[PDB]
Amino acid sequence: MDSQELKTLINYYCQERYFHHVLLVASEGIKRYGSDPVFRFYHAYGTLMEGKTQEALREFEAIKNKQDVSLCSLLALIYAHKMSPNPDREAILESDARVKEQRKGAGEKALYHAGLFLWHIGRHDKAREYIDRMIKISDGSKQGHVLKAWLDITRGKEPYTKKALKYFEEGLQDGNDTFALLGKAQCLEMR
């Protein structure tokens, strides 16, 4: 598998709550691509959901400063604190303050992973804010338009399917993408 296919496989095993399979694929990503923080972020999410939340907190603390992963790891720190038996509201609010501060200046990759992490939780209306910002910063990134077209599928409303299908076609003209092709296929299924 290519790195994007490992990442999108983990995003789906996360949607299906397969927490140990996430650790298997994340550990393969750490062996194949060990300089990339995103597989370490998924490994920390897997240890959180197994219930090794102290390990997950330290695994996020090891990577939270890294620019491509800081937003999604701060969102996962909020979730880890909320899963804990004694939720630290001050650490949650301090993490929300870091998210709101970084959201002003964040790069394209950081906003893409923030939208994808909110999409794990089904927070599609919040994910749209980060992906709209990603598109406006990037002057129309095709990865941004493909995920906006997927958020236009996940909200279910019919007229957005025509817009979504055009955004998948316009993403595909530059080259094939598995998630963009699946978005086109799902528009055809919805019609």
Are residues 155 and 124 in contact, defined by beta-carbon separation less than 8 angstroms? yes
C-alpha closest to that of 70 among 30, 29, 114, 26:
114
Q: How far is 171 from 131, CA to CA, in rounded Å?
A: 15
Angle ∠(60,65,68) on CA atoms, nearest 5:
90
Using a 10 angstrom Cβ sphere, with 0-12 exposed, 13-18 middle and 19 or more buried, the burial of residue 42 is buried
Please give the method by which this entry was determined: cryo-EM
Using a 10 angstrom Cβ sphere, with 0-12 exposed, 13-18 middle and 19 or more buried, the burial of residue 65 is exposed
Final resolution, Å: 3.5
Residue matched to tokens 């002003």: 104
